[PDB]
């Protein structure tokens, strides 16, 4: 019964070890460090009536959407600090937000199993609230203007078209808490309450690979801009980078001083800097290749809860547990 599964897992571990010719840090020792980086607060967006949970940059670098526990999902203009829209969510709580690559529609999650879709483009009206799940929602994303990928409080992650769940992924021991998409729409990856982080194929609907190098709950998953890697943020202080081709943990980012959790993880336009928010009031910036911190961003008063980087890479926006959302350039 389980003996075959144990043997298969042992064989997979042996194969992964056999592919480890050299460590990533071994190659990176020749490269020069990025050096110390000083990050200023270009703007401090404010106005939220309560704590915020997640935010997503727009397809353009200007517009962004912020989601708060107060139910007020307000669209923001980063350049001129203007609240273009204020959409009061039907559900009292939201846990994630998403912005269409077309920019026409805006997605909001929620503690309620129902996922709502707002058609921003006079007055905002909900387009079609999704069917639901058995549990809450964790992260949402837009493959296109017609398909939204949702992560649930149960195992199942789903692709939604019509209020119909075209596919229903499964295989997670716990609850999926975050996901990210590749530059192409073919592949995407997701975390879980358990240490397992998996990669799914949207067309096939089967988890091609599974990475389980962590030891605590995974709270954030970012995707490499190249599309061949993805970074995980665990409940414990360690954040690590996985390579899809190598299918293991290439590098591990951690420090003795940091003991707090990690809430959001995002890369830069070039992928050199891994901007990771922490459960502490600060936000760290790590040199991805060299695994060395290159600055500390501690603007917020409360714990950070979201990060993001514009498609042009002009600036990185961090949203905290406090009402203040600060754009860092």
């Amino acid at each position: 019964l389980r003996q075959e599964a144990e043997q298969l897992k042992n064989q997979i571990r042996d194969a992964r070890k056999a592919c480890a010719d050299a460590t990533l840090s071994q190659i990176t020792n020749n490269i020069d460090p990025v050096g110390r980086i000083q990050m200023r607060t270009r703007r401090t967006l404010r106005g939220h009536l309560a704590k915020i949970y997640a935010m997503h940059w727009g397809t353009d670098s200007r517009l962004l959407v912020s989601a708060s526990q107060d139910g007020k999902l307000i669209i923001w203009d980063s350049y001129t600090t203007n609240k273009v829209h204020a959409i009061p969510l039907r559900s009292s709580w939201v846990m994630t937000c998403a912005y269409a690559p077309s920019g026409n529609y805006v997605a909001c999650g929620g503690l309620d199993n129902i996922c709502s879709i707002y058609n921003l483009k006079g007055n905002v009206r909900v387009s079609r609230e999704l069917a639901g799940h058995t549990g809450y929602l964790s992260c949402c994303r837009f493959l296109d203007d017609n398909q939204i990928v949702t992560s649930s409080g149960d195992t199942t992650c789903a692709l939604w078209d019509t209020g119909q769940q075209t596919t229903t992924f499964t295989g997670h021991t716990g609850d999926v808490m975050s996901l990210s998409l590749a530059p192409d729409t073919r592949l995407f990856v997701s975390g879980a309450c358990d240490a397992s982080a998996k990669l799914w194929d949207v067309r096939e609907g089967m988890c091609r690979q599974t990475f389980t190098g962590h030891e605590s709950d995974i709270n954030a998953i970012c995707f490499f801009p190249n599309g061949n890697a993805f970074a995980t943020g665990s409940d414990d202080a360690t954040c690590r980078l996985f390579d899809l081709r190598a299918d293991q943990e290439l590098m591990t980012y951690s420090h003795d001083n940091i003991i707090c959790g990690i809430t959001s993880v995002s890369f830069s336009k070039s992928g050199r800097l891994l901007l990771a928010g922490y459960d502490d009031f600060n936000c760290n910036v790590w040199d991805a290749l060299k695994a060395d911190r290159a600055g500390v961003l501690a603007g917020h008063d409360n714990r950070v809860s979201c990060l993001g980087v514009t498609d042009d890479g002009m600036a990185v926006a961090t949203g905290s547990w406090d009402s203040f959302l600060k754009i860092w350039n």
């Binding site: 404010r46 008063d301 409360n302 406090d322 203040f324």
Partner: protein
Amino acid sequence: VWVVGMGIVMSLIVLAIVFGNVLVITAIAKFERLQTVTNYFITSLACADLVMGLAVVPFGAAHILTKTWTFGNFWCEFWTSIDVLCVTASIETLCVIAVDRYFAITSPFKYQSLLTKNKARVIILMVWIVSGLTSFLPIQMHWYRATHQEAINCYAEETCCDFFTNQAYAIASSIVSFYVPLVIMVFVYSRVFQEAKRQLQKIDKSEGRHKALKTLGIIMGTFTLCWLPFFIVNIVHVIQDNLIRKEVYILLNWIGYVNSGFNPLIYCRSPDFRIAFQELL
């Protein structure tokens, strides 16, 4: 040599008051999270303390040490105006802080709705405006000028400038500045102490397994010991001119002045304020 040490002591007192008020104002203003509804009153108190410690305390030290006022009569009248305005503003801000605590404790549910940022701004503006009406107008205009034969020459003479008030203005100014706020805060803190004792008794009753005395005691005692003796001797000297000498008046006035620098030590002991002060330095 006695005057030389007194000058150093006065300079140290003025510097301490200025530094404390500046630190409190910077901590309140720089950090948005630290600023709140009730921190506007502390901001007003710190601003009043800073203005007093930069306007009257150094000028008062210059007057007492040299024993000759170099500035003109109008400038001395303006200086006394600023002094009295600052004192009333500080005491009324203490009273407003006390009544805010009373509203927050005795009526918890109605506290958040009744008081807002606009409400705090308007009440602080009203406090400053009533302080101005009590201080500036009766003293900028010559209502307060003494009708006594004494000090008529002193008011006429440019170099000499000592406070000789009418028998009527002194009592009214004291009542608006200290006595009424004293009664208000004493009653308010008695009510808050009763509520704290009730809560402690309830906690003891529910769970089988002097803190309120210390905080209330220090908060009320500092203010009372600093200001009450001065605001009683100023009335006594009006009632009985032979009872009070000038040196006693000056000493009590400056002991009351030191309360301006003492206030930040009693209204910034919260851990958030300490963290903000550590971060700022």
